[PDB]
Each structure stands twice: as structure tokens, then as C-alpha cells.
Design a protein around this nucleic acid. Structure first.
Ligand SMILES: [Mg+2]
Ligand SMILES: [Mg+2]
Ligand SMILES: [Mg+2]
Ligand SMILES: [Mg+2]
Ligand SMILES: [Mg+2]
Ligand SMILES: [Mg+2]
Ligand SMILES: [Mg+2]
Ligand SMILES: [Mg+2]
Ligand SMILES: [Mg+2]
Ligand SMILES: [Mg+2]
Ligand SMILES: [Mg+2]
Ligand SMILES: [Mg+2]
Ligand SMILES: [Zn+2]
Lengths: 84, 60, 120, 83, 25, 155, 84
RNA sequence: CAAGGAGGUAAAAAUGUA
RNA sequence: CGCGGGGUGGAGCAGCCUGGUAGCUCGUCGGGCUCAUAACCCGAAGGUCGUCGGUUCAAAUCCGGCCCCCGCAACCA
RNA sequence: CCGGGCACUCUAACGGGACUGCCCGCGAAAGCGGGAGGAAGGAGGGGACGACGUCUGGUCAGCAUGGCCCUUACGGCCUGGGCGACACACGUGCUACAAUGCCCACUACAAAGCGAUGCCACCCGGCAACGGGGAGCUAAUCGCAAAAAGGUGGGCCCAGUUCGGAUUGGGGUCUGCAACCCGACCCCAUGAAGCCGGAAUCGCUAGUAAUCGCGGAUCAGCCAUGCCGCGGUGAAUACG
């Protein structure tokens, strides 16, 4: 299972790296659980449709979400910042 | 975690098998001897210094 | 002579003949022979029919043997499984139960070497 | 295993819980950490939870699981194959 | 020999005694 | 083994016959250092010789050694950058050791049940000339006459 | 330029976090330049040889070498740790 | 005894980690 | 929209004529030599033979329809 | 086993005893070959010892130590799990593939070590692990141990077979508050793969290789077939 970061997802991961430290471990915790079970685990692993068919989200916090998508041996993270 | 463990090793209670002998000079848990209470390294350091009564360089 | 369901040892010592039955080893064989009163040196090629029927009556009125003993072992293994026991699930995968080493040799239980490629 | 001369089933916690529970009734869920404990027949019929190292997995007890321990029914590892 | 639990040399190699090697000279 | 002649060992002579050559065979029987058994196998075998032929069992032993003792042997050599295999005559110390080895090596290849019967029949067959070790002798001797083209590489 | 994290690479990147933030800031510097100039720029980006033929390395420290590989659309990272 | 002159050669065996 | 030939392990080929067992090399994987790589040595796996239908007791093999690739012919006027 | 002696064997401290001093031959010497001389000799056999330095070798997890980082925590306590996971690959080994071998019974011969919060003599229960009793020993006093291979007597007759013991079912003992992951034993029944090993690869020149047991450290107990030492029988070969 190899990680795939897109353009905006990596910049937002660096955005949490520069400002607050406590969320960055929580993010990596969420990546760890979707690595061992891709669709289940922590923080309500939720599907999306009605432009996002085949994409799944979890909540990092109460407003921002950690969306993702899965393929055979890869883990794509599209964003780790605010939904919309 | 070094110093709290050495003084966990000093206290006796709560199911005696939980007591493990430990060196008092350095605080090693392994290769510690019942004849001295020193580890295997503190043994050599003091025995070469001569602070061990009767201990000599064995040779046969 | 056919005792437990098997005949197979023809001229050989009788204690050896009873060790050749699933369910009777060396100790149960000598127990049956010190019961019956047969010198084990008297072979199975030369023994009285009365000794044979007394020996058969004893060894298959006393303990449980070949078909039923296997049924009991299989029933106990089936009871160990289907209940969620640790030893039952080790029997289920086909792994050893008695706390052994599986990073290395456990091949009597595991089978033949199933060599898998191994990147690096 | 154990010796037979001395009192088998070493634990008191879930025992002092279940001896209230079997005579009062009403089949409740009990969490314990005692994996070293023998399933003694007043425990038959109950749903108790055992810690595995991570969480509390519930087990259901019926009359054939008796001469065992609770750690026999709480799997610690996860294998799921090889790939 | 040496590893068999039901023989003389097996109990010698262990240092245990049993039925197959009891304790008496 | 670069400096000296790494000198030859001397053995104690036998306690029933008084010779070095029999004690060497007692040592060539010897597996895991059991000399009491190694002498016992040989001494059971001598009684087999005593009763299967009316001949003294030391006198069949000496000639069975001499009938198995090779004369020339082919050995590999490296002078001139080449690896041929060159025949050369054998020292009688090595002729003895090779015959002493070949008799017990062939006797272990015999299909007979006990050990002493294998040893005894091997001595009877080698002294009369048809043992398993005389086949090994004549094959080793066959290669030297076959490779007699290379004996100009003698030294 | 999407980022690809191999098991070893992300395990180490999780090791440079909670050990040395200086290394993490250096790696994010090298990634920010590799995302812009993949075969030139910072950290002496060299083409590699025999056992890593098809890879590229930028210096992190005097020992540590960031081993990456480039595609048209993405960026592989085989290491963010030890001297090969 | 002391020593030179002309002359037949060792093989078939590659590379280096940034 | 004429004629001939060909689709087979990852790559390149043979087996089809004359239906019963798909073989060769390189490559892949495990081991050995070397400090290491290549070379070399030991051992093992891998296709169902374009696709659909038919004949036969049995189809890679025989027949027919279709898809793809290659070669040839398209002259008089 | 006593009186007694302590002459021997043992134990233990200090000594003598080889330095090729002596003989022959070689040489200018150093030294070399051989020999009565004794136990030994031409460093007697083993140890302890291991230069200037290399590997910018290893150890910040024995300890110390400069710098960086965490402090309602990268600190501290507890319970449970884990270090024991298994499609595989490698190293070190142990047990074997048997008849110079296996099993049963009887009878011998060691060295070096260890123990009174232990060694346990000797009885009784017990198929046995072991449990009840209880004597001796601050220990060349008593105990751990009877050494094992060996010798004698009996059985198997070369057949996966009385070789080999895996793996598994059942019943128990002991330690520990505790044996499910994860203990060591004892008993019953299972008794597999292996019939001697491809390319390759390792140790050993004399009590050495090989073979056989015994003791200690750690240790409540033990996953010890490991390490460290001790003795029993005891090869082969070195042309070069
Ligand atoms: Mg302890
Ligand atoms: Mg056996
Ligand atoms: Mg490295
Ligand atoms: Mg070449
Ligand atoms: Mg090149
Ligand atoms: Mg093709
Ligand atoms: Mg024309
Ligand atoms: Mg010196
Ligand atoms: Mg290091
Ligand atoms: Mg470990
Ligand atoms: Mg395990
Ligand atoms: Mg040497
Ligand atoms: Zn110390």
C-alpha cells in the first residue's frame, strides 16, 4: 500500500505542519487505520456521490474532512482540508 | 526509563516473583550475579581495579 | 490371526503383533499379555486358538480401538473447533497448537515448502 | 496444567459479579480482564467480554466450553492470510 | 535414542527419571 | 606441514599376535574411538578364518594386504600451467595405508549381516585374489598404465 | 506532480517526524524544488547507477540521501533516510 | 669450477555503490 | 473488400499436414560462487494455444462465420 | 569399623629439576642432525599476555558524557497483549536415517564443581512425574550422582520396520497469585518426514578429530539441543 498525495492535499498537509502540531499526529493516525482496513475504522468512514462516485471520506475534525479514494495497492488522498 | 526501574527493583512486595535481581552500581537487569549484586561489566571494572577481595586473574 | 479388524502380523512376536494395532502400543500390549499369561517369545505362527480368543476378548472388551478411537479423536477435534477455541482455530488453519515456532520449522504441521517469491 | 489439589479458577472479580448475576438473573454483559480464568458451570448461558490487548470481544458461553480459560476465546492476533 | 521420552538414553539426555528409568542403583 | 617431514607415528604391537600391521587394522575398524569393539570384531573374524579354512589367520592377513597393496597411482600435477594427472610410484607407508583402508571400505560394502563375517570373508577373498578391494586396487593400477603417457612428469 | 510514498519511505518520514524536524523541513524543501525542477536544482540531484538504475538522489545531509524516481505525472520516493 | 650470450612464457576470466 | 499465409507461457519461435503427452531459447522465482554486480553452477513455476459454432468417443490439430496482422495481384482501355 | 600408625594414595605450601649443561659430526660463530642422561628435553604440552596503528569498526540500550528535543507530557503507575506472530529465505545446532545398531536386566571405573530463606540420605503411597515423613551436613564430615560409552546375559534379523521420533488426542505432577496465547516434566495411544543428502561449504596434526556422559552461571520454574568448564574410550594422515 503506497501513499498518493495530490497537489492540494500535500500543500494542506504542510499547512497543518506549519501551524498546529496536535492535528498532524491525528492525520497520520487516520492514514494508519485506512491502511489496515480501507473503508472502516476511526472517524465515520463515509462515502460520497453526486459528483464524487468512488470516493470516500472520514472526518479529521468537526468541520474539516479527510477525503480519499482507493485502488488495488494505492491510497490516494485528495484533500486533508475543508469539505468544499 | 532507567531510574524508576532501579528503585522498583529495591522494593519487595506485590507477588515476590515480580522481584528481579539487579545491579546496584549501574542498574543492569541482565547478567547480574547473586554472589555480588554487580552486573557483569561492573564486576570486571572493579576486579581489575582491585576492589574485589580475593578475586584474581584466573589461569590454567 | 485377525484380532481387532487386522490380521497383518503373521510370524512375529505377539507383543509386536499387538503394537501393530492403532490403539495398543507397547505398554497396553504387555498389560494384555501379563493378563492372559502368554510368553511373548511364543510367536503368532504357533499359538493356541484358546489363547487367541482370550486375547481378542480382552483387547476388545477392555479399551476402545481403531475405528472408534479415531472417531473419538475426530469428535474431540471437532469439539475443539466450531466453538472458537484457540487450539481449535490452530487445528482449523492447520497450524500447531502447543506453543511452537512457526517463523522457522513447523513443516510437519504446515506441509511441504510452499516457496513464495519474496521481493528483496 | 494446574494441580488438582488446590482451588482451581484463580480470580474473584468476575466470580463475585456472576454469583450475584446468576441468582438475581437477567443475563447481563460483563467486561473483565481475567484471561487466566476457568469457565465454571454457573457461567453457562452468559455473554461476557474479554480483553485481547486492544478491545473487549464478547464471547457467548454454552455448556461445552467448561474446562478452558477465557484467553482461549479471545484471539490476540490478526492474521487474515498473506495477500 | 536420545530424544525418545520412553527409553533409557532419552531420560539420561534430559536428566529426568520415569518409568523407563527409575531412581535406584 | 611446510617445515618438517611431519614424522610417522609408531604404534603399540598386538596383545594376541604382536604386530604393528594388525593394530593398524584395529584402528581402521574403529568408529567413534571404540578400540575394545574394534579388536572384538577382528578377533571374532579370526575365529571365522580359523574354522572356514584350515589356515593361520595372521598369514592370510599379511598376504591379503600384499594382494591389495597398489604399486603405482595417478596423481594430479601443476607445472607449466596445465592440469593433467600423472602416475607415480607409491611409498610403502602409503601402500600399507591404502590397502588397510580398502579392505575395511570394501567390507562395509559387503551385504553380509554381522560385521566380523564381512571382515573375514573380505580377507579370504583378497588373499585368494577376488575381494572387493582388489577390484579397487586393479582399477587404481589400471589408470596408471592408461595414463603412462604422462609419467615423464615424474619427480 | 503527485507524490508517491513507498512503505519504507513513509515509515522513515514518520521516523524523521518525532525525531528531527530539521530533516522534515529539509525534505519538504527538496520536494518543493523537485516538484518544480525535477532534474536540476537543490541537493546535487544526480542520476544513479547499477542497483538503483532509473533513480535519482538529492543530498539531505552528509549521509542521508533522498532517493526519488520521476514519471510524466508523478514522483516516486524510495527513501528519505540512509545512504542507499 | 666460477657465469654471459642469443629464446620458448603466465590465462580464458569483465565491472565498481553515488 | 480478389488471392495466399499467420494469431500459442512476458519476448521470439516450433508442434497443426497425418486429432490423444503443448516443446526450445531468453526471461521470472528459490539457492550456490564474489566484498558486491555481471558471467557461471544447482533447482522450480508459468500458457490452455484470436473468438463463436459444428464434426468426433476425444479439437491447438478437421470444417465453417467473424475480428486483427503480413505478403501478393488490381492489367487491356 | 575401632585401637594405633600416618609408611603409601590424596590434599596443600615452599623448593629442587635442563640451561641442548655432556658425547660425536658440521660451522668462523650463532646454530643444526643423531645419542646414552633422566619423567621430560634443543621454546615439554596448554594457558594468562597480545606493539606503533588501521577499520572516521561497535556500544549514547551497562555506566558516564557535550549538544538538540518532550514536560498535565518522548515522564510515572496498573491490567491485558507483545517481544513466541508465518506464504517464505539464511546462519548456528540438536535428534536420526540403524545390525561397528536398538531395547530390557545386572554389574563396575572418573574429574571439576554446587549447597543449611538449600542439597535431600533413608522409609511409605505411587506404573512415574511427584507427594507425605524425617536423619545428616555451617560442609575432603552429609547430600547432589547411580558416572554415560564400556562388560555380561536375553530379545528383534535389516523390514520404514522393537531404527527414528515429529505432530496430535486424553489423564496427571511441580513451580508460581497466576501456564489461553506462552513453561518444564510423567503416563497412555498416536507414531509422520527421513533408507544417509544438488551446486557448494566447515572444523581438526596427539589425548588432537570423533564419541560418551557430568557440574556450574543465570534461575520460583523454564522453552538450555546454548554458553562455560570437567573427565571416559580414543583414530587416520601429512609425499609435497
Ligand atoms: Mg525472576
Ligand atoms: Mg524408539
Ligand atoms: Mg545500511
Ligand atoms: Mg567474461
Ligand atoms: Mg558497465
Ligand atoms: Mg506472442
Ligand atoms: Mg497486354
Ligand atoms: Mg610475552
Ligand atoms: Mg551502528
Ligand atoms: Mg526476541
Ligand atoms: Mg508461536
Ligand atoms: Mg596447528
Ligand atoms: Zn553493574
Amino acid at each position: 500500500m503506497k501513499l498518493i498525495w495530490s497537489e492540494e492535499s500535500w500543500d494542506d498537509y504542510l499547512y497543518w505542519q506549519e501551524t498546529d502540531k496536535r492535528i498532524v499526529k491525528k492525520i497520520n493516525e487516520l492514514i494508519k487505520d485506512t491502511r489496515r482496513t480501507p473503508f472502516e475504522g476511526k472517524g465515520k468512514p463515509e462515502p460520497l456521490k453526486h459528483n464524487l462516485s468512488g470516493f470516500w471520506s472520514r472526518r479529521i475534525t468537526e468541520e474539516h474532512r479527510l477525503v480519499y479514494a482507493v485502488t488495488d495497492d494505492s491510497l490516494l488522498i485528495a484533500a486533508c482540508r475543508y469539505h468544499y | 526509563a532507567r531510574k524508576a526501574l532501579i528503585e522498583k527493583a529495591k522494593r519487595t512486595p506485590k507477588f515476590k516473583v515480580r522481584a528481579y535481581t539487579r545491579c546496584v552500581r549501574c542498574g543492569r537487569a541482565r547478567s547480574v550475579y547473586r554472589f555480588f549484586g554487580l552486573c557483569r561489566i561492573c564486576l570486571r571494572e572493579l576486579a581489575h581495579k582491585g576492589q574485589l577481595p580475593g578475586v584474581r586473574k584466573a589461569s590454567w | 490371526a485377525r484380532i481387532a479388524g487386522v490380521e497383518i502380523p503373521r510370524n512375529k512376536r505377539v507383543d509386536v503383533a499387538l503394537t501393530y494395532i492403532y490403539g495398543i502400543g507397547k505398554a497396553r500390549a504387555k498389560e494384555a499379555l501379563e493378563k492372559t499369561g502368554i510368553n511373548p517369545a511364543t510367536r503368532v505362527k504357533d499359538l493356541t486358538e484358546a489363547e487367541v480368543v482370550r486375547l481378542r476378548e480382552y483387547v476388545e472388551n477392555t479399551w476402545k480401538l481403531e475405528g472408534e478411537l479415531r472417531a473419538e479423536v475426530a469428535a474431540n477435534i471437532k469439539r475443539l473447533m466450531d466453538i472458537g477455541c484457540y487450539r481449535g482455530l490452530r487445528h482449523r488453519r492447520g497450524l500447531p497448537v502447543r506453543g511452537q515456532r512457526t517463523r522457522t520449522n513447523a513443516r510437519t504441521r504446515k506441509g511441504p515448502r510452499k516457496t513464495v517469491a519474496g521481493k528483496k | 496444567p494446574r494441580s488438582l489439589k488446590k482451588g482451581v479458577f484463580v480470580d474473584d472479580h468476575l466470580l463475585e459479579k456472576v454469583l450475584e448475576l446468576n441468582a438475581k438473573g437477567e443475563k447481563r454483559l460483563i467486561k473483565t480482564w481475567s484471561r487466566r480464568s476457568t469457565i465454571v458451570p454457573e457461567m453457562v448461558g452468559h455473554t461476557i467480554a474479554v480483553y485481547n490487548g486492544k478491545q473487549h470481544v464478547p464471547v457467548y458461553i454454552t455448556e461445552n466450553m467448561v474446562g478452558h480459560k477465557l484467553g482461549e476465546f479471545a484471539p490476540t492476533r490478526t492474521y487474515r492470510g498473506h495477500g | 535414542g536420545k530424544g525418545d521420552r520412553r527409553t533409557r538414553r532419552g531420560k539420561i539426555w534430559r536428566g529426568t527419571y520415569g518409568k523407563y528409568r527409575p531412581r535406584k542403583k | 606441514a611446510r617445515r618438517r617431514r611431519a614424522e610417522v607415528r609408531q604404534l603399540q604391537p598386538d596383545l594376541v599376535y604382536g604386530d604393528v600391521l594388525v593394530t593398524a587394522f584395529i584402528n581402521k575398524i574403529m568408529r567413534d574411538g571404540k578400540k575394545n569393539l574394534a579388536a572384538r570384531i577382528f578377533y571374532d573374524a579370526c575365529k571365522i578364518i580359523q574354522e572356514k579354512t584350515g589356515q593361520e589367520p595372521l598369514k592370510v592377513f599379511k598376504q591379503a594386504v600384499e594382494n591389495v597393496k597398489p604399486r603405482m597411482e595417478v596423481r594430479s600435477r601443476r607445472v607449466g600451467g596445465a592440469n593433467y594427472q600423472v602416475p607415480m610410484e607409491v611409498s610403502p607407508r602409503r601402500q600399507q595405508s591404502l590397502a588397510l583402508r580398502w579392505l575395511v571400505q570394501a567390507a562395509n560394502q559387503r551385504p553380509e549381516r554381522r560385521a566380523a563375517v564381512r571382515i573375514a570373508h573380505e580377507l579370504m577373498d583378497a588373499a585368494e585374489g577376488k575381494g572387493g578391494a582388489v577390484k579397487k586396487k586393479e582399477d587404481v593400477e589400471r589408470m596408471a598404465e592408461a595414463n603412462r603417457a604422462y609419467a615423464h612428469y615424474r619427480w
